[PDB]
Amino acid sequence: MELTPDQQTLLHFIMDSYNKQRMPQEITNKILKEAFSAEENFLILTEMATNHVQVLVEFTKKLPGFQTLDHEDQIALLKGSAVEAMFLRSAEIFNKKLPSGHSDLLEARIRNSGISDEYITPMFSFYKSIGELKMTQEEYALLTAIVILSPDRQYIKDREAVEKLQEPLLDVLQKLCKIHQPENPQHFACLLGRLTELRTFNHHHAEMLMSWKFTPLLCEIWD
Amino acid sequence: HQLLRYLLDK
Ligand SMILES: C[C@H](CCC(=O)Nc1cc(C(=O)O)cc(C(=O)O)c1)[C@H]1CC[C@H]2[C@@H]3CC[C@@H]4C[C@H](O)CC[C@]4(C)[C@H]3CC[C@]12C
């Protein structure tokens, strides 16, 4: 059994928008080149997060059906999913993109930025548990779409119109698990577990927030 | 959400 023509179409639009994500080498160089200290490190990491939110808005606008939602719900979806989507995207990069030595400097900055090991430890435990699953790009992109179109964020008006956009993504993802990794019949359930594990980062992030500065885009999206 | 909505409408 295979994706229907309409699921192939849906998967194609998601994949094309996911692949056009890029972070500027201008930022990436700062990881390599700027001075090292708790304040500088937090500043650089805050710049990377600011860029991932911009990439995220561009990704999200091209999701099939998103630009038919009401504007207020569009904002509500972005605010509720930002942290989770950043971590999913960064997970993909640690496990597939970044070599051992530059992941090392990035992590050194993260661990030397004035953030609690309460945050840092589950974060790196998430990265390694996600890297174990050996997800395809298609799985990362659908999962990210499914995180974003989550109908039970606070403050959404029309929850059903969001439900109607998420459920076909869920169906595509389960089909994809049977075709891409049919040697593990429970692959879909493992992806689900990462959905719930991602949700815990909202908790740690809210505690990092209370302790404290940021960019205007981050101030809007997190209040 | 001035900056967010600006990025949404581009
Ligand atoms: C470092 C990592 C981004 C890594 C990444 O995405 N790299 C990359 C590299 C390359 C490349 O070299 O080619 C290409 C690409 C490409 O997308 O193409 C991408 C970011 C993502 C989320 C960030 C946290 C958010 C919460 C919080 C916000 C606070 O403000 C600061 C502290 C906190 C905990 C942040 C810390 C640092 C984090 C983990």
Residues having CB closer than 6 A to ligand 1 are A 21-23, 28, 42, 45-46, 48-49, 52, 86, 89-90, 93, 97, 106, 110, 115, 205
Q: Which ranges of A62-136 does DSSP label H, i.e. alpha helix?
A: 71-92, 100-111, 117-133
Other C-beta atoms closer than 10 Å to the C-beta of A94 total 18
What experimental approach yielded this model? X-ray
Query: Is A71 in contact with B3 (Cβ distance < 8 A)?
Result: no
Please tell me which residue of chain B has the smallest CA distance to A72: B5
Cα angle A88, A198, A203 (rounded to 5 degrees) comes to: 125
Range of the domain at A215: 1-223
**C-alpha closest to that of A1 among A179, A198, A185:** A179
Pair of tokens at residue A68: 């038919």
Secondary-structure percent of chain B, ordered helix, strand, coil, rounded to 5:
80, 0, 20
CB-CB: which of B2, B3, B8 is closest to A74? B8
**Class of residue A140 by CB neighbours under 10 A (exposed 0-12, middle 13-18, buried 19+):** buried
Q: At a CB cut-off of 8 Å and minimum separation 6, what does B6 contact?
A: none
- Total of domains in chain A: 1
Q: Which long-range contacts (CB under 8 A, 24 or more apart) does A102-105 make?
A: A102/A31, A102/A32, A105/A31, A105/A32
* CATH number of the domain to which A127 belongs: 1.10.565.10
Resolution of this structure in Å: 2.2
Ligand 1, residues A19, A50, A93: which to mutate, most atoms within 8 A of Cβ?
Answer: A93
